[PDB]
Ligand binder design. Sequence first.
Ligand SMILES: Nc1nc2c(ncn2[C@@H]2O[C@H](COP(=O)(O)OP(=O)(O)CP(=O)(O)O)[C@@H](O)[C@H]2O)c(=O)[nH]1
Ligand SMILES: Nc1nc2c(ncn2[C@@H]2O[C@H](COP(=O)(O)OP(=O)(O)CP(=O)(O)O)[C@@H](O)[C@H]2O)c(=O)[nH]1
Ligand SMILES: [Mg+2]
Ligand SMILES: [Mg+2]
Lengths: 413, 283
Amino acid sequence: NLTDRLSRTLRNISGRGRLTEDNVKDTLREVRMALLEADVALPVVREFINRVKEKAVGHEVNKSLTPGQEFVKIVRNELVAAMGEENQTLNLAAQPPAVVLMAGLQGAGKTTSVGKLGKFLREKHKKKVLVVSADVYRPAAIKQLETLAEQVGVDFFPSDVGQKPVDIVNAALKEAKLKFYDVLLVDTAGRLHVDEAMMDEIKQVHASINPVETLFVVDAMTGQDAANTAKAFNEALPLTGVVLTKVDGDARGGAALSIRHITGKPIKFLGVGEKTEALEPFHPDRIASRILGMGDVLSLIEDIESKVDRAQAEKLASKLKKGDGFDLNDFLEQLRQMKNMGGMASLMGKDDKVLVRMEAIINSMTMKERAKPEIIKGSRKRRIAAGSGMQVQDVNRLLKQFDDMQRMMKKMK
Amino acid sequence: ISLFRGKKIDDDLFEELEEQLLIADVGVETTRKIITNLTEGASRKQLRDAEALYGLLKEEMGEILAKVDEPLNVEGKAPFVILMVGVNGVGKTTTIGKLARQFEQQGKSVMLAAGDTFRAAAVEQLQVWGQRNNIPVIAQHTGADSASVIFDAIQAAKARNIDVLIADTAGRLQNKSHLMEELKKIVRVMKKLDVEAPHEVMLTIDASTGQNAVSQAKLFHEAVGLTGITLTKLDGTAKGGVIFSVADQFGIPIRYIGVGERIEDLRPFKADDFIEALFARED
RNA sequence: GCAUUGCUGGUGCAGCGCAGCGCGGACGCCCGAACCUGGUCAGAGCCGGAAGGCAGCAGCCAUAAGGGAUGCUUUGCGGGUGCCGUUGCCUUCCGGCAAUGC
Ligand SMILES: Nc1nc2c(ncn2[C@@H]2O[C@H](COP(=O)(O)OP(=O)(O)CP(=O)(O)O)[C@@H](O)[C@H]2O)c(=O)[nH]1
Ligand SMILES: Nc1nc2c(ncn2[C@@H]2O[C@H](COP(=O)(O)OP(=O)(O)CP(=O)(O)O)[C@@H](O)[C@H]2O)c(=O)[nH]1
Ligand SMILES: [Mg+2]
Ligand SMILES: [Mg+2]
């Protein structure tokens, strides 16, 4: 469109003015629509909009960049800190046989992550791991962990379907302490937070065995429901860590911001596949840019800032190096301001050929040679005379006069 | 729902309805498309009664699910093949156990196929569902080719004279292309015994899943060609309003709904009753 | 239910092949030579009686040698790579039809 090029230049213009709602309201709609499409719950979306507003207007105003692009930084930076206050919070193992309880909804990725946790604590942390299953509801859920234990090379605790889940976890720790196992990885069944019956089972199991780490496993693609899930699972169990699974998917993973907001418990692990190798320690910088979606905007903001940052440092470094006060660059500027005078020093101070010849010698020099007279030597002196049409003695004469000038400059002013 | 009766129609109540629509995971492009039909509908008849907004919403939502209301007809073919596809952990295997018992209820012989030859004890899991219904399960040890196993299950379903065969597959994420061309590879070897087979490509989608369901339907349909949808784990706080965006975009029919972990906890999809349960103010 | 036999299929090796990762080069982008590359040559230099030239330094532009960020691009090389493809094969492992026997 014809008005498209006109409207683009009006917004692209350097907004020196204070970051106010007038510029925000038009572009804040893009952020709210992306967050809802990312799958972030409304109580966290509505509270985060107000959280950004207090920081956006509050003395955080830039002269350069689009007004609707300098506020995106405030959205982006506050998203990273809200998601991961601490980077890589690993499972505590500074106590006797450590208990790691795994709880979440039906089919979140619990038993697989117990298996992926085994390889982590066995190869990267070298611990005596023991795996147990309290899932006596899902068909062959016990045999599932049994094969996963054989895969990593971790010892597995035997269990029946006839066995009570509360007695399994109680007798599991008994064998764990006896053989002095470093970590006791406890796997539980799929539990719906609505169900009073099994939600009472996990609470009783959390009481039966004191878990130093109560990891809440949740699917990365889970939508608005994560609000109801995070509330009930933290209000019933004292959680200490979140495990986000199926992060390898194309899903934005909006629940990750929804879980960290409501529970307040930090995300500790990320699953990137079905395999046992597929476990990564939590990092918010990566997942924050994945929830935002708009990367083509952030790719230019970080590219424009770098272009300015390199130019601001290079123009200041040259000024800090030339801060000594005198060099041949300043001496040449004195000659031209003197030649510009219609009366001349010859008639004022009571010889003319000397000044004209002196300008030509400094003119033939490089930028480096003018800034530092000490680098001029043998071949460097022969180069100046060849192009200037003077002699080796002429250049050497000029340099001696300049040396006495800087000695007189530093001694006075 | 009852709190809407004692309120006056304004821009504040429309914002109250939009936020209760978004909390169902319906979407942005799907929620604002209905609000455009509601704001137009409120001027068409010119009604300032609270009783109308609850009725108008049920009418337009029920119009979308009216296009996608066709039930599954497994009868006629022998063996009728139902290919179970979807992402990792949505209820695929459990749904087969629920399905096979509703077909035995209808009086049709059922056989099962253990196709998740990638996930640990998945053969063993489907084998328990076979024993729960007293149905034969064609299976091979985990690690074997899924496509070639389902092929041997069809060759068995034909020879043993079976009315319905439900074939299981592994949990696969739409972005994992190698696993997607593996799903295509399953159907390719299926056509070697029957060009009509698979007679159904049932996609299982978790009720709690968000806007991932959009690409979950898109890329699964683009690859194999979905003909069925089962909205499982709907028994919780999960409304699964994302199904309105799916039917409006691809038009794949919803066949059944998962409402529990037990065999009896499965019902065929009903359009009118689904809307009533969406705004259920219950504890 | 178990064995024998036929056919067929998967695993399982093994060899090619792809995908991939690592390292080396292309191509390209950006940076880039006081002088010993070129263009332009301010100032200044030179030849001639003048007119006119010649020579050429800085700067600036281009750019060998050579760096640097990186790439649904291209290739060579190598793998305690491989939810891929393929041919070949043997010991067992496991399936699918079919024939017999307890
Ligand atoms: N791609 C991918 N798949 C995952 C990840 N984590 C788990 N899975 C997969 O999701 C599915 C469910 O995993 P599982 O470990 O059985 O979940 P669960 O929560 O124990 C199931 P239940 O609630 O019945 O006990 C499996 O197919 C598994 O391979 C992940 O990070 N990425
Ligand atoms: N509460 C509830 N749980 C369900 C429903 N349908 C399935 N589940 C549960 O979800 C979990 C995963 O079910 P499963 O049938 O193994 O899913 P899947 O998609 O085959 C897993 P994979 O992708 O690994 O093969 C199981 O714990 C199961 O009992 C449902 O309608 N409600
Ligand atoms: Mg489990
Ligand atoms: Mg399954």
